[PDB]
Motif scaffolding. Structure first.
Motif, PDB file in Angstrom:
ATOM      1  N   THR A 181       0.825  -1.204   0.000  1.00 58.85           N
ATOM      2  CA  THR A 181       0.000   0.000   0.000  1.00 58.85           C
ATOM      3  C   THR A 181       0.861   1.256   0.000  1.00 58.85           C
ATOM      4  OG1 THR A 181      -1.726  -1.200   1.191  1.00 58.85           O
ATOM      5  CG2 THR A 181      -1.869   1.195   1.157  1.00 58.85           C
ATOM      6  N   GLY A 182       1.939   1.259   0.787  1.00 57.20           N
ATOM      7  CA  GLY A 182       2.841   2.398   0.789  1.00 57.20           C
ATOM      8  C   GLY A 182       3.554   2.582  -0.535  1.00 57.20           C
ATOM      9  N   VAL A 183       3.943   1.474  -1.174  1.00 55.92           N
ATOM     10  CA  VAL A 183       4.605   1.550  -2.474  1.00 55.92           C
ATOM     11  C   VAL A 183       3.682   2.181  -3.507  1.00 55.92           C
ATOM     12  CG1 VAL A 183       5.355   0.112  -4.400  1.00 55.92           C
ATOM     13  CG2 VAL A 183       6.339  -0.231  -2.150  1.00 55.92           C
ATOM     14  N   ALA A 184       2.406   1.787  -3.508  1.00 53.52           N
ATOM     15  CA  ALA A 184       1.452   2.400  -4.433  1.00 53.52           C
ATOM     16  C   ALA A 184       1.223   3.873  -4.104  1.00 53.52           C
ATOM     17  CB  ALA A 184       0.133   1.631  -4.407  1.00 53.52           C
ATOM     18  N   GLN A 185       0.958   4.166  -2.825  1.00 56.46           N
ATOM     19  CA  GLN A 185       0.620   5.520  -2.406  1.00 56.46           C
ATOM     20  C   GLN A 185       1.765   6.489  -2.638  1.00 56.46           C
ATOM     21  OE1 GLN A 185      -0.742   5.172   1.677  1.00 56.46           O
ATOM     22  NE2 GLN A 185      -2.879   5.319   1.016  1.00 56.46           N
ATOM     23  N   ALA A 186       3.007   5.999  -2.635  1.00 57.97           N
ATOM     24  CA  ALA A 186       4.163   6.854  -2.886  1.00 57.97           C
ATOM     25  C   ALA A 186       4.041   7.576  -4.222  1.00 57.97           C
ATOM     26  CB  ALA A 186       5.434   6.007  -2.851  1.00 57.97           C
ATOM     27  N   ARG A 187       4.041   6.815  -5.316  1.00 56.71           N
ATOM     28  CA  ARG A 187       3.960   7.419  -6.639  1.00 56.71           C
ATOM     29  C   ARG A 187       2.611   8.088  -6.867  1.00 56.71           C
ATOM     30  NH1 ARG A 187       7.775   6.386 -10.401  1.00 56.71           N
ATOM     31  NH2 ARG A 187       9.426   4.903  -9.842  1.00 56.71           N
ATOM     32  N   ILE A 188       1.519   7.472  -6.389  1.00 60.64           N
ATOM     33  CA  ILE A 188       0.201   8.038  -6.666  1.00 60.64           C
ATOM     34  C   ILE A 188       0.047   9.400  -6.000  1.00 60.64           C
ATOM     35  CG2 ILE A 188      -2.250   7.749  -6.259  1.00 60.64           C
ATOM     36  CD1 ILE A 188      -1.594   4.651  -6.606  1.00 60.64           C
ATOM     37  N   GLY A 189       0.442   9.517  -4.731  1.00 61.20           N
ATOM     38  CA  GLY A 189       0.364  10.794  -4.057  1.00 61.20           C
ATOM     39  C   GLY A 189       1.408  11.799  -4.482  1.00 61.20           C
ATOM     40  N   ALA A 190       2.564  11.353  -4.985  1.00 62.98           N
ATOM     41  CA  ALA A 190       3.501  12.302  -5.580  1.00 62.98           C
ATOM     42  C   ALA A 190       2.891  12.961  -6.811  1.00 62.98           C
ATOM     43  CB  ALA A 190       4.809  11.599  -5.937  1.00 62.98           C
ATOM     44  N   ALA A 191       2.287  12.150  -7.686  1.00 61.42           N
ATOM     45  CA  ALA A 191       1.589  12.706  -8.840  1.00 61.42           C
ATOM     46  C   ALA A 191       0.409  13.567  -8.406  1.00 61.42           C
ATOM     47  CB  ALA A 191       1.129  11.582  -9.765  1.00 61.42           C
ATOM     48  N   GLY A 192      -0.263  13.178  -7.321  1.00 55.66           N
ATOM     49  CA  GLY A 192      -1.370  13.976  -6.821  1.00 55.66           C
ATOM     50  C   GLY A 192      -0.939  15.330  -6.291  1.00 55.66           C
ATOM     51  N   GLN A 203       6.191   8.024   2.320  1.00 60.71           N
ATOM     52  CA  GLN A 203       6.477   9.380   2.764  1.00 60.71           C
ATOM     53  C   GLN A 203       7.727   9.960   2.130  1.00 60.71           C
ATOM     54  OE1 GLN A 203       6.526   9.445   7.077  1.00 60.71           O
ATOM     55  NE2 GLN A 203       4.438  10.259   7.119  1.00 60.71           N
ATOM     56  N   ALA A 204       8.642   9.122   1.636  1.00 67.94           N
ATOM     57  CA  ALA A 204       9.835   9.612   0.955  1.00 67.94           C
ATOM     58  C   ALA A 204       9.490  10.532  -0.207  1.00 67.94           C
ATOM     59  CB  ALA A 204      10.670   8.439   0.440  1.00 67.94           C
ATOM     60  N   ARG A 205       8.894   9.983  -1.262  1.00 66.12           N
ATOM     61  CA  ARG A 205       8.567  10.839  -2.389  1.00 66.12           C
ATOM     62  C   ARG A 205       7.313  11.667  -2.156  1.00 66.12           C
ATOM     63  NH1 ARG A 205      10.103   6.465  -6.213  1.00 66.12           N
ATOM     64  NH2 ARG A 205       9.652   8.062  -7.789  1.00 66.12           N
ATOM     65  N   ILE A 206       6.443  11.288  -1.208  1.00 69.56           N
ATOM     66  CA  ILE A 206       5.344  12.190  -0.859  1.00 69.56           C
ATOM     67  C   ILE A 206       5.889  13.506  -0.316  1.00 69.56           C
ATOM     68  CG2 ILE A 206       3.289  12.507   0.510  1.00 69.56           C
ATOM     69  CD1 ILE A 206       2.874  10.544  -1.594  1.00 69.56           C
ATOM     70  N   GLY A 234      14.664   5.888   7.255  1.00 68.31           N
ATOM     71  CA  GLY A 234      15.785   6.377   6.466  1.00 68.31           C
ATOM     72  C   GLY A 234      15.442   6.500   4.994  1.00 68.31           C
ATOM     73  N   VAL A 235      14.687   5.530   4.471  1.00 72.10           N
ATOM     74  CA  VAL A 235      14.173   5.627   3.108  1.00 72.10           C
ATOM     75  C   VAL A 235      13.318   6.878   2.959  1.00 72.10           C
ATOM     76  CG1 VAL A 235      12.555   4.561   1.493  1.00 72.10           C
ATOM     77  CG2 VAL A 235      14.337   3.184   2.556  1.00 72.10           C
ATOM     78  N   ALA A 236      12.488   7.166   3.965  1.00 76.67           N
ATOM     79  CA  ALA A 236      11.696   8.392   3.947  1.00 76.67           C
ATOM     80  C   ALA A 236      12.580   9.635   4.002  1.00 76.67           C
ATOM     81  CB  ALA A 236      10.704   8.388   5.108  1.00 76.67           C
ATOM     82  N   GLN A 237      13.637   9.596   4.815  1.00 75.24           N
ATOM     83  CA  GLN A 237      14.503  10.754   5.008  1.00 75.24           C
ATOM     84  C   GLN A 237      15.312  11.087   3.765  1.00 75.24           C
ATOM     85  OE1 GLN A 237      15.599  12.748   7.975  1.00 75.24           O
ATOM     86  NE2 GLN A 237      15.534  11.337   9.710  1.00 75.24           N
ATOM     87  N   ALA A 238      15.622  10.091   2.930  1.00 77.47           N
ATOM     88  CA  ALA A 238      16.537  10.308   1.807  1.00 77.47           C
ATOM     89  C   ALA A 238      16.019  11.366   0.832  1.00 77.47           C
ATOM     90  CB  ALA A 238      16.779   8.988   1.077  1.00 77.47           C
ATOM     91  N   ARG A 239      14.875  11.093   0.199  1.00 81.60           N
ATOM     92  CA  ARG A 239      14.329  11.998  -0.811  1.00 81.60           C
ATOM     93  C   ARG A 239      13.977  13.349  -0.204  1.00 81.60           C
ATOM     94  NH1 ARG A 239      12.721   9.547  -6.333  1.00 81.60           N
ATOM     95  NH2 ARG A 239      13.021   7.310  -5.953  1.00 81.60           N
ATOM     96  N   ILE A 240      13.401  13.330   1.000  1.00 81.20           N
ATOM     97  CA  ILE A 240      12.995  14.563   1.665  1.00 81.20           C
ATOM     98  C   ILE A 240      14.205  15.434   1.968  1.00 81.20           C
ATOM     99  CG2 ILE A 240      11.859  15.506   3.699  1.00 81.20           C
ATOM    100  CD1 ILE A 240      10.055  13.145   3.753  1.00 81.20           C
ATOM    101  N   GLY A 241      15.294  14.833   2.450  1.00 79.33           N
ATOM    102  CA  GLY A 241      16.491  15.603   2.730  1.00 79.33           C
ATOM    103  C   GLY A 241      17.142  16.155   1.480  1.00 79.33           C
ATOM    104  N   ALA A 242      17.179  15.360   0.407  1.00 79.55           N
ATOM    105  CA  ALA A 242      17.748  15.849  -0.847  1.00 79.55           C
ATOM    106  C   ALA A 242      16.971  17.053  -1.369  1.00 79.55           C
ATOM    107  CB  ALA A 242      17.770  14.729  -1.885  1.00 79.55           C
ATOM    108  N   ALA A 243      15.643  16.928  -1.446  1.00 83.07           N
ATOM    109  CA  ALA A 243      14.831  18.032  -1.946  1.00 83.07           C
ATOM    110  C   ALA A 243      14.865  19.226  -0.998  1.00 83.07           C
ATOM    111  CB  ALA A 243      13.398  17.562  -2.179  1.00 83.07           C
ATOM    112  N   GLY A 244      14.921  18.974   0.311  1.00 86.49           N
ATOM    113  CA  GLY A 244      14.972  20.066   1.266  1.00 86.49           C
ATOM    114  C   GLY A 244      16.259  20.859   1.193  1.00 86.49           C
TER     115      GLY A 244
END
Lengths: 313, 74, 73, 73, 73, 73, 73, 73, 73, 72, 73, 73, 73
Positions: free
Chosen positions: C23-34, D27-30, F24-34
């Motif tokens: 669910t998180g894998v799907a929501q990642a890309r879907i909510g980024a596009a959102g 939450q990463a790419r979100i 950490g996976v969450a922190q990676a993209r967020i830190g790069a963009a931040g």
């Protein structure tokens, strides 16, 4: 043209493509297959009441002759389309109630409250022939009937291909259809021999003749479409278990949702009954809003891919 | 119905549903991202995007099919 | 024996965990596009919300089968 | 008892860990898309914030099932 | 009896789960490119749908082998 | 004792471990963009920091689960 | 009653599943390129099919080894 | 019951290891973007350093869990 | 007793399966680039085919190892 | 006795997963660093510092592993 | 006999499988870039073929270990 | 014997293999960027070489502890 | 004679397998960029060859560890 009962289902087929003249229109079998298998996928009468209520709510638009517009969905449905889809919906309602009554469902079940229908677990009148949540023995029957539906659907679908090949006198569409029928009966014979009657006398000959008449089509399909496409045909045969799978998934989810509320009513009783009813209502509404799309999409997906692609629609 | 088998069937059915959900998630990720990209400025594509998103649910469908036939095969 | 509760516990745990992972894998890309679509225009908010709330049925089914095993617990 | 308590511990830990992994990989790419939108327009902070905080449903489901398993410990 | 009746369940779970994983990791890219082609031109619906639904034979073969080894109980 | 107090150790170990992996996976993209946003303009520091430290709830949830498990040790 | 049959079943299951995973990861890229070619030229249909269908040999080999190992059961 | 003391070692092992892995997957993107920002403007050094050292709390929590587990040895 | 045969089965299953996975991840990129080359020039069909079917040697090696294991027992 | 092998497994996991994490960090960090070096040599020190910083993960993993070895 | 034979078989199986997996992940990028170079220049075939075939030596490295394990078997 | 030697060996194998995997992940990007720099300019043969050879300390720190743990055999 | 020999075998097996996996992960990107540089200009053939043969030491280290493990049986 079409008879008036099959007329409202023309928009489920004309969306994809239009047939060439002299071919077979696949539309007459949609109103006799799709509502039936959608109803047994849903297998409910409690949700069928909600479907009838939303159908009555939608029929007011066709009664007062106004367009239906939703901004978040971005659709504008004329009354002459709303009437067709309402006709489709209350056609589906009959099948889903006639299968919910034999699945023993009441937006969940009342059998945990009152024994309205007989069962071996709670003795009474003539019991349920096919239970919903008991997967020990009804699973085999439901899987076998789903496989029977798949094989008869495919059989009719490329029997129509053989008929149109006979009409066109190309003979390629005829011989390929007969060969794929032979491959189908051969793999069905092999699957019957497996996990069943091992090495039956009449099974082996039928499988051998089917394989021979399948190999007969090599003289026109020597390269392209003889070897690899039989795997796709077998997959199209075996992809019909999703009916039972979605039905059991929805039934168990609804059963657990009503079991939570029933235990909550058992927990308190004086005030827990109404709180449990409210929680069950909001949870059932959320799950319905989640899964109605998939529940509607799967049986029409079957008719879209496993049946239309047989005659090159 | 042996006790060790009663837990090993749980492990097997859990693996089935979990990996089926993982496969459906990894499909729906890209499919839904492209769907939102297609409804960003071409809003009439809502139906196509929705049916394309709802198409790969059959993987979880088969996974929990296997799960609750294993539950009955306890 | 006595391993029954523990083994069904690890079954429920891995089932719900991998369902949540999907669910998180799907929501990642879907909510980024959102988020991108909403930043483009506010009118896409409901479309993005339903598009990312749709994959929640995966973790719903995961907790469903987890509660199925919990019934045996 | 025996190893049943330890295996229940393993199961609840696996549940919460994979739920955390799933909501993190969301939450990463979100949050990447959200902070990208905020860095160019401050007005859309709230929508990005609720879109980032929304995938925590997976980790609260994992916490719920972990607490349920811990209740049998 | 023994642990065979329990480990066959692990076999079925691994088979159908990894077959579904392969089908999903295919269908991701196939569906993304297909819906892109459909948005470019609506005449590609027939090709895109059959391209996206072609890799289902993988999970179908996984279901078949799980079913036969369930019958081999 | 035996496995009873031994398997809880690996349970809390993975419970904190792959929760830390997920955050950490969450922190990676967020830190790069931040940090990209900070390099673009220094006024985005508070937004970048509160978006960076918001996925830090995953390790505190994992630590809560590990503390509960250690209470049984 | 024994222990080898269950491990044979899990070997068949993981063999089929990993072969399916390999076929899926191949078919993702190959079919995406094929449908991208179709979106600009319909004449590439046969080449796309004969390029994306030969990775099914992996599943064919996995199914045959699974069958010959089921023959031991 | 000598196996009791061995499993706590495994637990603390993956407790520190997965935390270090999550720290590393954060450090990758964060340090890449930080050195990209520093290579253009030299005044971003402090911001890049604090953004790089912020995800090192994950390995600190892993070390805390490992030390707590080692205290039971 | 007799658990060795099941372990030979799981070993040969791994040997065929993740070798097939490796050739699948190879054939993914190779076939995608080959289809891209064919879509602009059909004369590269032989080169694309002999590059796509070249990593089948991984499968034939894994199958040779699995055949050796099968002939062992 | 039997605990020795599990202590060995935990030690191997602790060193190896830490090595994997610092490798996956140093991949992108060193790639960006040498990309910066190829266009300007004046920033060698910052790139070296940024590459050598994730080896604290290795230091933590090896100290935990050495603690486990002392426990062995 | 004993458990040693089957575990040696497992060792052989994953030794060839993981080596083939690494070879496949190498061959993916190498073959993709090689056939991309061939699509624009045919004279690069001599370099592309050796650059694709030379990283197949680690399959041989894995399978020699598997063969000496089979000799021990 | 006594199950300690084999698990010690699998610990050494896990340590060496995961250290090699980590340094391979590092060298994948580092060497690619270094050979891009060497294609741009020949003078970078010192910096690119030292940057590629630096993450071999991961293998160094892996096989040294592998040898230390081999000393217990 | 016990699980020691088989576990030593599986130890050396996954040692060489993961070493080969890391080497393939490195060689993918390194060989792709090297063949790109060779296609761009033929002068850097030897530089690309040595740059991609440098991460081959991981397989050498893994196989020497495997040989040391094999010497104990």
């Amino acid at each position: 043209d079409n008879p008036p009962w099959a007329k409202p289902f023309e928009l489920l087929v004309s969306f994809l493509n239009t047939p060439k003249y002299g071919t077979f229109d696949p539309t007459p079998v949609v109103p006799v297959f799709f509502p039936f298998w959608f109803g047994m996928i849903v297998g409910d009468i409690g949700y069928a009441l909600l479907f009838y209520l939303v159908g009555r709510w939608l029929s007011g638009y066709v009664k007062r002759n106004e367009p239906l517009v939703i901004d978040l969905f971005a659709l504008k449905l004329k009354p002459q389309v709303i009437g067709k889809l309402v006709h489709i919906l209350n056609w589906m309602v009959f099948w889903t109630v006639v299968w919910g009554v034999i699945y023993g469902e009441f937006f969940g079940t009342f059998l945990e409250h009152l024994g309205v229908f007989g069962t071996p677990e709670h003795p009474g009148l003539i019991p349920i022939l096919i239970h919903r949540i008991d997967t020990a023995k009804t699973a085999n029957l439901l899987i076998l009937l789903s496989v029977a539906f798949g094989v008869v659907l495919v059989f009719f679908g490329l029997a129509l291909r053989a008929y149109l090949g006979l009409k066109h006198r190309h003979m390629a569409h005829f011989w390929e259809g007969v060969g794929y029928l032979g491959g189908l009966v051969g793999v069905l014979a092999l699957a019957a021999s497996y996990l069943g009657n091992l090495q039956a006398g009449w099974l082996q000959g039928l499988m051998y003749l089917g394989f021979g008449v399948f190999l007969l089509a090599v003289l026109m399909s020597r390269i392209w479409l003889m070897i690899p496409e039989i795997f796709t045909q077998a997959g199209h045969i075996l992809s019909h278990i999703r009916i039972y799978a979605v039905g059991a998934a929805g039934g168990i989810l609804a059963g657990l949702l009503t079991d939570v509320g029933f235990a909550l009513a058992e927990r308190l009783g004086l005030l827990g009954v109404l709180l449990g009813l409210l929680v069950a209502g909001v949870l059932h509404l959320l799950i319905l809003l989640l899964t109605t799309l998939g529940h509607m999409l799967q049986p029409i997906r079957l008719l879209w891919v496993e049946f239309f692609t047989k005659f090159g629609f | 119905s042996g006790g060790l088998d009663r837990g090993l069937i749980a492990v097997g059915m859990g693996l089935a549903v979990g990996l089926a959900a993982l496969g459906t998630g990894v499909a729906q990720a890209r499919i839904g991202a492209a769907g939102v990209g297609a409804i960003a400025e071409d809003r009439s594509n809502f139906g196509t995007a929705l049916i394309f998103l709802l198409l790969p649910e059959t993987l979880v469908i088969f996974g929990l099919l296997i799960a609750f036939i294993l539950n009955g095969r306890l």
